[PDB]
C-alpha cells in the first residue's frame, strides 16, 4: 500500500528500504551471532518472504506492485545473507541491488507518466516506439539476478558457496528465488514492451529530457559497476568454482525464457489462467494479508478497545 505516490517509490523501495532496516540488521551481526536460534529464525523469515514475494510478484497486474514484492524478496535475500554471518555480502549486495532497482523504478515511472494506466493488462507494444525505457528496464533486470558480466552476480555467488558449505537447503531457496524473480521481471517486460498494442497505449510518445536523463545516467552506473570492481581489486567471490557460477545463470535465463515464451508466444490465451484457479487469485491478493490483519491484530485490538 506504500505504492501510492510515485518516485518516493523510486527512492523508498530503492534507498530507504535497502539501508534502513538492513543497515541496522547488518551492524547487529555480532550480537545476533550470540544465539544460534535468532540466526535460524532469520533464515526462515528471509526464505519465506523471498519465496512469497517472488510468487506474488509473478501474479500481479499493477506494474508498480509487481516490483515492490520483488523488493520484499530481495530484502529477504539480505536477511538470508546476514543469517549466515556474512555482513560483507549484504553491504556489497545493497549497492548493486539499489542501482538496479533505481533503474527499474525509473523506467516504470516513465512508462506510467505517459501511459496513464498501471494495469499490465492494458499496456502493450512499446518496444519499437519506446527503446531507452525498455533497454533500461532490461539492464536493470540483468543487473539483479544473473549475467556474471553485470555486478549483482558476484554477491549472490558467495551466498551460494556459503549456503552450500553449511546449511545446504537454504541454497535451494537462493537458487529457486533466482528463477521466479526472473519469471516476474520477464512477464513485466513481455507485457509492457512486447505483444500487441492496446487503446490505452495506442499513442505513447517517449518522455521529455528530465525523466530519462537520471534513468540513462543511472543505467551507466550499473554497466560500470562490474568494471569498477576490476580497476580496484574488490574481489567479492574468491573461489570461482564455475560449477556454481553456471547455476545461477541457467536458473535465471530459464525463468526469463519461459516468461518470454508464455507471453511472446501467442500459443496460449493471454489472460492466462492457472490449472488451479484457486491459487492464482490467492497469490494475486498477497495471501489475503489484509483479511488476515483485520482478523488477528486489528480485530482484537479494536474489540477489546
Amino acid at each position: 500500500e506504500a505504492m501510492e505516490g510515485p518516485i518516493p517509490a523510486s527512492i523508498l523501495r530503492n534507498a530507504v528500504v535497502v539501508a534502513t532496516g538492513a543497515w541496522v540488521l547488518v551492524k547487529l551481526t555480532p550480537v545476533l551471532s550470540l544465539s544460534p536460534v535468532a540466526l535460524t529464525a532469520l533464515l526462515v523469515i528471509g526464505s519465506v518472504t523471498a519465496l512469497g514475494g517472488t510468487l506474488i510478484a509473478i501474479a500481479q497486474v499493477d506494474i508498480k506492485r509487481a516490483l515492490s514484492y520483488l523488493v520484499s524478496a530481495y530484502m529477504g535475500w539480505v536477511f538470508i545473507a546476514v543469517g549466515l554471518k556474512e555482513p560483507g555480502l549484504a553491504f556489497v549486495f545493497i549497492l548493486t541491488y539499489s542501482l538496479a532497482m533505481a533503474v527499474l523504478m525509473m523506467s516504470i515511472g516513465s512508462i506510467i507518466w505517459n501511459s496513464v494506466t498501471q494495469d499490465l493488462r492494458l499496456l502493450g507494444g512499446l518496444w519499437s516506439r519506446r527503446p531507452i525505457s525498455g533497454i533500461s528496464f532490461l539492464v536493470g533486470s540483468a543487473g539483479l539476478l544473473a549475467v556474471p558480466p553485470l555486478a549483482s552476480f558476484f554477491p549472490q555467488a558467495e551466498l551460494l558457496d556459503t549456503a552450500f558449505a553449511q546449511l545446504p537447503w537454504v541454497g535451494g531457496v537462493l537458487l529457486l528465488m533466482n528463477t521466479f524473480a526472473a519469471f516476474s521481471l520477464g512477464r513485466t517486460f513481455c507485457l509492457v514492451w512486447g505483444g500487441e498494442v492496446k487503446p490505452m497505449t495506442a499513442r505513447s510518445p517517449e518522455v521529455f529530457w528530465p525523466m530519462i536523463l537520471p534513468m540513462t545516467v543511472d543505467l551507466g552506473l550499473v554497466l560500470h559497476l562490474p568494471i569498477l570492481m576490476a580497476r580496484f581489486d574488490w574481489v567479492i567471490w574468491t573461489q570461482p568454482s564455475l560449477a556454481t557460477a553456471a547455476a545461477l545463470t541457467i536458473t535465471a535465463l530459464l525463468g526469463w525464457g519461459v516468461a518470454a515464451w508464455v507471453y511472446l508466444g501467442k500459443a496460449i490465451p493471454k489472460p492466462v489462467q492457472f490449472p488451479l484457479p484457486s491459487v492464482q487469485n490467492l497469490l494475486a491478493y498477497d495471501f489475503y494479508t489484509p483479511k488476515l490483519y483485520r482478523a488477528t491484530v486489528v480485530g482484537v485490538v479494536d474489540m477489546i478497545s
Binding site: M3, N114, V116, T117, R129, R203
Partner: protein, 426 residues
C-alpha cells in the same frame, strides 16, 4: 411546445430547448463568466504562440531545455485575425500580441528581470498545463479525422524527411534514428498534436478577447447573448485549415498539408471539447491508479475527469493539475472580479478556489455553446413548427445530458452540474 418527459435533469433541457443557458442567467452569474473569459484569454494568448513554437521550431529536440522561450518574432506573429490584415477580423484590437501579456513577460510579478531569471524564479505563465492538454488529446486518439491520417504512407514519409533534415548536424541522433526509427517518429506525432492544440487557441483567444469588449460596451446583456456570440464565432471559423509546417534551417517541411482538407471544427474543436472538457486523464491526487482497485476506468470513453467533472475545492494542493492554470489565470484578473472575490469567503486568501469555480461556470457556458452549435449544425432550430423536428432536438439533448448521469464509476457523483445551478456554489 412539447410535454414534460421524465428526467431528473429535465429542468435543464427545458432551458436548452428554449434558448440556452446550461447554467442560470443571473447578472452576477455573467459578470464572473466574462471576467473569467478575460482572465483566461491572456494566458491562452501565450499558449497558442508557445504551442506553435513547439510544433514548428522545437519539432523534435532531445534537450529542449528552454522550450518556453519563443523567439522575439513569435510575439509579433500576427494572430490570423484581430487587426487590419486579418482573415475574419474578430476582436478589433491589435493583431500582434496583448499589451497585458507582454507586460507580464516583461515585469512578471516581481520586476523587470531577464526572462531566464523570470523562469527559474517561477514567475511564469505555467506553460506545462498547455502541454498536458496537448498530450491529453493524443492518447485519447481525439484528434479528429487526421489521427487516422496521422498513421502512415503520407505522414511517415514526411516525418522521415523532416527528421533526417533536422538532425543532419549531429550523427549521434541520426544514428539513433536509424536503429529505432519509431522512437523520434512518435515524438513527431506529438509535435503535430501540439501544433493542432496551438491552432485551436488561435481562434478562442480572439473570441474571448472580443466577448469581454462586447460586455464592456454593453452589447452582452445575458448569458444567452454570450453563448450566442460563442456559437456565431464557432460557425464563423469552422472552416479554417489545420497544418503543421515544421520550419528547419532555411527550409519548411510540409508535414500535414493544407491540401488534405482538415478543418478547425472537426479536427480541433470537437475532438478538444471531448478530450479536455470531458476526459482529461484522471487526477493523480484524487484517484488511485491501482489496477486492482477498480477506480480508474479501463476504456477511454468513461474518463470523467474534465473541467465539467472536476472538483475545485482542492485547488492549490498537491496532485491536482488545474491549479497550474488557476495560478496562471489569477494575475490577469479584471478589477470587477477581484472586488467581487475580496468581499467573500476567506477574502483574497482562497482566491484560487473561487477563481476556479468561476472558471467552471464559464466553461459550462462554453460547452453549452458547443451543444447549441452542434444541434444547429446537425439538427433543427428552436423556431421549428414541426413536432418531429422538435423531438429530434429533444432526443439529442437527452442523449447529451445522459453523459452527465451514467453511473459507471461515480460519473454521476462527479459532474458539477446541478451544483453549478446553485447560487451558493462559489
Amino acid at each position: 411546445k412539447l410535454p414534460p418527459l421524465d428526467h431528473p435533469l429535465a429542468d435543464i433541457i427545458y432551458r436548452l430547448e428554449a434558448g440556452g443557458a446550461l447554467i442560470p442567467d443571473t447578472p452576477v452569474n455573467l459578470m464572473k463568466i466574462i471576467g473569467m473569459y478575460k482572465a483566461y484569454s491572456i494566458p491562452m494568448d501565450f499558449y497558442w504562440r508557445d504551442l506553435l513554437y513547439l510544433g514548428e521550431r522545437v519539432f523534435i529536440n532531445p534537450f529542449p531545455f528552454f522550450k518556453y522561450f519563443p523567439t522575439k518574432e513569435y510575439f509579433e506573429l500576427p494572430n490570423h485575425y484581430a487587426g487590419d490584415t486579418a482573415d475574419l477580423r474578430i476582436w478589433r484590437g491589435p493583431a500582434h500580441a496583448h499589451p497585458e501579456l507582454m507586460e507580464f513577460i516583461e515585469k512578471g510579478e516581481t520586476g523587470k528581470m531577464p526572462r531566464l531569471l523570470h523562469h527559474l524564479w517561477h514567475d511564469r505563465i505555467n506553460m506545462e498545463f498547455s502541454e498536458d492538454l496537448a498530450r491529453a488529446m493524443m492518447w485519447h486518439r481525439m484528434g479528429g479525422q487526421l489521427d487516422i491520417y496521422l498513421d502512415s504512407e503520407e505522414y511517415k514519409a514526411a516525418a522521415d524527411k523532416a527528421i533526417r533534415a533536422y538532425f543532419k548536424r549531429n550523427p549521434l541522433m541520426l544514428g539513433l534514428y536509424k536503429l529505432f526509427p519509431d522512437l523520434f517518429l512518435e515524438q513527431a506525432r506529438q509535435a503535430t498534436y501540439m501544433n493542432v492544440l496551438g491552432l485551436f487557441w488561435e481562434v478562442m483567444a480572439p473570441v474571448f478577447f472580443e466577448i469581454s469588449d462586447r460586455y464592456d460596451e454593453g452589447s452582452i446583456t445575458s448569458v444567452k447573448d454570450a453563448m450566442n456570440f460563442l456559437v456565431n464565432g464557432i460557425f464563423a471559423i469552422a472552416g479554417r485549415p489545420i497544418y503543421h509546417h515544421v520550419y528547419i534551417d532555411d527550409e519548411v517541411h510540409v508535414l500535414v498539408p493544407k491540401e488534405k482538407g482538415f478543418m478547425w471544427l472537426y479536427e480541433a474543436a470537437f475532438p478538444y471539447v471531448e478530450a479536455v472538457f470531458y476526459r482529461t486523464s484522471p487526477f493523480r491526487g484524487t484517484k488511485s491508479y491501482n489496477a486492482q482497485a477498480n477506480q480508474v476506468p479501463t476504456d477511454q470513453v468513461d474518463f470523467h475527469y474534465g473541467i465539467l467533472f472536476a472538483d475545485k475545492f482542492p485547488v492549490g494542493t498537491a496532485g491536482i493539475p488545474p491549479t497550474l492554470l488557476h495560478q496562471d489565470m489569477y494575475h490577469f484578473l479584471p478589477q470587477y472580479l477581484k472586488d467581487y472575490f475580496h468581499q467573500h469567503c476567506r477574502g483574497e486568501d482562497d482566491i484560487l478556489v473561487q477563481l476556479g469555480i468561476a472558471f467552471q461556470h464559464a466553461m459550462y457556458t462554453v460547452t453549452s455553446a458547443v451543444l447549441q452549435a452542434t444541434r444547429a449544425a446537425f439538427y433543427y432550430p428552436l423556431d421549428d413548427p414541426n413536432p418531429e423536428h422538435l423531438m429530434a432536438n429533444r432526443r439529442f439533448f437527452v442523449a447529451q445530458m445522459d453523459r452527465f448521469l451514467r453511473p459507471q464509476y461515480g460519473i454521476a457523483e462527479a459532474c458539477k452540474i446541478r451544483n453549478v445551478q446553485d447560487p451558493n456554489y462559489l
